[PDB]
Amino acid sequence: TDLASIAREKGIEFFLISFTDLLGVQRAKLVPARAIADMAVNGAGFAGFAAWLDMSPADADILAIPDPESLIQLPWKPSVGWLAADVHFEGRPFPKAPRVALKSVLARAAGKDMHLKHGVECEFFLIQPDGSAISDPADTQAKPCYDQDALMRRFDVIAEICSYMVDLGWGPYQNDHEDANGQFEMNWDYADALVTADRHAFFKFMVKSVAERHGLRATFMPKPFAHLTGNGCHTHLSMWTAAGDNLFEGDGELGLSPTAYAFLGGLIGHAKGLTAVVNPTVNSYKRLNAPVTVSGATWSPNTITYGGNNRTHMVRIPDAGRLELRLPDGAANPYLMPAAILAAGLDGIETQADPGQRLDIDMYVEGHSVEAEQLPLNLLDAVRALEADEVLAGGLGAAAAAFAKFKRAEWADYKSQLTEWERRTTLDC
Amino acid sequence: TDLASIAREKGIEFFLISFTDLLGVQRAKLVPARAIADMAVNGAGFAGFAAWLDMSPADADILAIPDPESLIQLPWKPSVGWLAADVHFEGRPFPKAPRVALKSVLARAAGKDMHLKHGVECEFFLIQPDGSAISDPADTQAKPCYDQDALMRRFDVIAEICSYMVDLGWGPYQNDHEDANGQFEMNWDYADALVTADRHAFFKFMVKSVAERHGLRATFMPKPFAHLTGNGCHTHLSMWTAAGDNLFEGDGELGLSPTAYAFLGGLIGHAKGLTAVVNPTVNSYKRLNAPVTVSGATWSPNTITYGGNNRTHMVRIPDAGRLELRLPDGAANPYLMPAAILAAGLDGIETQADPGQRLDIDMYVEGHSVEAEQLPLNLLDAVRALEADEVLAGGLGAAAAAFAKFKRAEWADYKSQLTEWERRTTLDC
Amino acid sequence: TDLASIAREKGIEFFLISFTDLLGVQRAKLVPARAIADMAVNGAGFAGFAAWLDMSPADADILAIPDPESLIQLPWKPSVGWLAADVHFEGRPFPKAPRVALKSVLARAAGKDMHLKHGVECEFFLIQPDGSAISDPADTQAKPCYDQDALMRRFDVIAEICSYMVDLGWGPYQNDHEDANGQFEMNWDYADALVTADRHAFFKFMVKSVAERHGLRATFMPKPFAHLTGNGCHTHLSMWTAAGDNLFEGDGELGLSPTAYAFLGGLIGHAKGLTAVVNPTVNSYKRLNAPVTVSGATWSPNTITYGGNNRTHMVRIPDAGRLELRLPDGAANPYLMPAAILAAGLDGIETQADPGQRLDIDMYVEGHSVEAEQLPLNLLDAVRALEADEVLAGGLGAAAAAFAKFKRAEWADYKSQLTEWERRTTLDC
Ligand SMILES: Nc1ncnc2c1ncn2[C@@H]1O[C@H](COP(=O)(O)OP(=O)(O)CP(=O)(O)O)[C@@H](O)[C@H]1O
Ligand SMILES: Nc1ncnc2c1ncn2[C@@H]1O[C@H](COP(=O)(O)OP(=O)(O)CP(=O)(O)O)[C@@H](O)[C@H]1O
Ligand SMILES: Nc1ncnc2c1ncn2[C@@H]1O[C@H](COP(=O)(O)OP(=O)(O)CP(=O)(O)O)[C@@H](O)[C@H]1O
């Protein structure tokens, strides 16, 4: 792939050489086309301490080496070409970088002829530019899910993005108004994990950019409104052979194989530590274990459990040959999430983990009359669990410890904030 | 070069005959094409006392003789042609004028077959017209460096200026959102010092003019916001023979030659006086030795030290064959800065100056763990050092004493200003 | 002295056991009469780190032992008795406490039969409660000094305090409107240095308190208004034998003795370090070396010089038998100031210091016509001089080092404040 030739052919005047840091932030440099060949070979230089990579201002620059197969001409601005990149440091891929970490786990699975494919359901809200309320003041009803009126009221922005995804070859197939007022979701086809991760990273940027062009704002925040359903990132998962067979497809219950159940056994066994990574913010813990919403259900997990075609659990089995992890939220890192899921799932397979008993009940109601482990209740406990989880931490490489350091500091920063609630309830102590 | 003929050919209707004064202020006269031939030969008359040149209202006019090879048709207004000029007084170049002062030092070095080449990293903020806040209220995060979102939010202005630089033949190659919210930087190829100095003077005017056309404002202020990273002007330096060999390239530590280390010895040796010139404002001293910023590092020097590929010192060695002086800020005079740097480095070469021990540590966390000289803490102390430095004062000629005079007065003016901080902390003494 | 008996007899219901810290802050504990006997013997406990004493939160409490001879029943609230105290730490007088530091230097002088007596002219402004403007909007003229109208407009507050001083036995004898609009001064009789120091500490508290009772606010700030004269604390000084002979009285010039001139020699010799103590704030340096005021003179020192009956110098000789040190401002510590002056003076006497030639000229218009040493121009330079001054630093003991540490930090805090002036003069650099 000759980026310089493509630039001339396609009318690309600038490239964004982009990488995702440990907090999911999209870091990028805008390089004119005249300079792209040098960047493609040598990488684009960044001072790593200035991003969430856990480095030092005394370190040599990281070099972000773009993956030319990731190229996307911005559909709303085709003269700019976006590239995803691997962060290198001292002549090697830098293990603290999320994309590099995912590729490491992918390579170990590939080594055993197991290829992760996943799809993501990236819920988002459309809100006012100042972020104080949803973008549509006429979207107010108690059960607004799939509301035809409010959906069509945002047809222009939804249709524009959906059409871009058609053009990009992602195979979009549905657009919904989701369960909270102001909340939407646009699905597209699953793919090899690295393809989906790059798409996931690009998708969020695309949605935010387009919303902004329409005088709106998009947020993937886990719990932007106290009494409304939160933003999930439900992740659909299966493992394939290079020959093209889905290893999860089987003759067991619900059409799953023993490999599928073992992979699930790993998700279940490592759930506490996995929460730290797929629920990576303080705010994440207001979506999990949340009080019932105005629409009648939170639709998020409270417990470390799985069901059949049942949306009240940590894991749902929607159909034969795949698992839906409902645990992640909209803040989950597009690269770290698949990486930690894969690490856990692999350990499950390797150890033939038992996921325990499928629960065919509504956990929100018929959950108090059963023994089920509760998810970590806050970021601190989740991070504590990640640190104690040798498989996850080891699986993610140096990314895990750096991630844990940052999230601990975020939690501490959160603790120090004085809230109006404490004042009202404690001033008269 | 026939400016009159060029005017007819290129459709230039007015020329800005411009020179830079001791404070870096761009002084210009707008002359209609009909009058250019006269100005080219004879120079444009200015009352020198009215600019920062340390003259008298009783003096005969200075004559600014334009350098025809410096011609730039304003890319945003091609009917106007900008020219850099040498200030002449009483029939000869005026030593108090920055460009003249630079050319004098360059000629002494050239006499020894040593040709300074440099590049500049001119950081700037984009702010509201009233100067009170950055231009992008959505650019708020603690670590905004290389933020893809904020970068693309200013694509139009950044892309316009980058494309001008392509057309101008400067070889631009990267555009970044820098470490402070609202802060950016656009790099271009190094060149002979005089070429880069003229480009540097033009660039700042270009950035400000274009920002203003977009309803924005650009500032090169060293420290426009108390808790954010400031505007550096990191200067990359090498010395070349007329035959085309880089004298700094060598077999020693980090691919540097003894000549490079001696030049560096001169920078370290004259650092206190050099600080007055490359940090020429009261505000400069709020960038140097600053308390840690929200982003986690100031990225500016505190000490007279150097490192390898390490951004925590006064000098960084980014790669074989050059030095990065991190000392200067956005207020540094585009002509006086290379001038003082060269005077210092030349002396280091002539005396075989020892730069001392390279420090492979983060000076921000380890400044105490070592004996290092601190930079002058304020403009008064810097100017005192400059006045005491015979090599610098001698190297800059009469420019040095005039500059010191002005900067002493600025510091005295600053001292006389009553601050809100003082009233808060002293009213109850 | 039986404070419990005095309490019963005078109707004192509470005592303020007070000590002055290194920044001059009055620290006090309010003790009901039933507990005074205990406090008088054992001392009143305080956590020393919580005041400006350079201690540790891990230190045992300091004990402030009240001087029963210092008792003052607050004239505006006689049921409360104020006591000055010596801070003890671990069973010994605490050398970092100003009053203890002063008593140490007095002891050394007394051991040589030399007893310091001094009087203080404590200028202050009466300002609005919010501190933004003077209290009398009708006080506006260019030369308001001794203005009959404005003086009588504040007759009630001035007369109340003056009558208080009469009753306290301080021998008040004049009340003036001073040279700045809104500025006043009330003089009282000199006394033994420790008496005057205690009186000085109480006086500031009394003026502030009574002003507040009248809906006004008093400030001793050195330079509260940019273009107005500042608050001096002119200190009148003589040295006496126990027998009662003024050692400064003599047959030399102006009725001064060789002892007086040697003491003066100490003041001149140690002036740079002395400045740090008697001009202890950043703001202090806006009073010293200030641009001429609306009234035609600053009345503060610019240079290390002395004159006769002449108010343009650092030292004035008002009459035979005493020296006026015009250096100190309204922020000067009531204890540290006489302590530092005495240490310098004693050294002068010890070494027979030569004060140099008396200058019988106006230094404001004659600064150029003579070779004179300028005073430290800012707090940082003053503190540097203090640390370099062995006699002074040694004479003040550990208080000097603690003071210097604090004042360095204040200067650094000041440096970090972005001023509107910088913005205006630097945004377009
Ligand atoms: N075998 C498989 N492995 C991984 N992902 C798969 C998969 N089969 C389908 N997917 C993906 O999972 C995501 C969701 O698929 P689908 O929409 O059919 O499930 P679901 O109907 O439970 C979602 P919703 O409730 O929003 O309608 C899609 O991106 C889809 O491509
Ligand atoms: N031998 C040399 N002498 C002087 N300047 C040189 C040079 N080689 C490169 N430069 C210049 O130095 C400037 C910076 O170059 P470069 O971008 O490679 O360094 P760097 O990566 O440390 C900058 P940043 O941190 O912003 O990415 C450019 O103007 C470049 O042209
Ligand atoms: N021998 C001495 N030693 C120390 N202080 C003395 C002194 N004799 C007088 N003083 C004191 O000096 C202070 C000022 O004295 P005085 O008012 O006479 O001088 P001055 O007239 O220069 C003051 P102003 O300019 O405000 O009118 C008073 O506190 C006074 O008691």
Numbering used by the authors:
A (entry chain A), B (entry chain B), C (entry chain C): 2 to 430
Publication text:
Monomethylamine (MMA) is an important climate-active oceanic trace gas and ubiquitous in the oceans. γ-Glutamylmethylamide synthetase (GmaS) catalyzes the conversion of MMA to γ-glutamylmethylamide, the first step in MMA metabolism in many marine bacteria. The recombinant RhGmaS was active to catalyze the ligation of MMA and glutamate to produce GMA, with ATP and Mg2+ as cofactors. Sequence analysis indicates that GmaS is closely related to, but distinct from, the glutamine synthetase (GS) family, one of the oldest and most ubiquitously existing families of enzymes in biota. However, gel filtration analysis demonstrated that RhGmaS is a dodecamer in solution, which is consistent with the result of electron microscopic analysis.
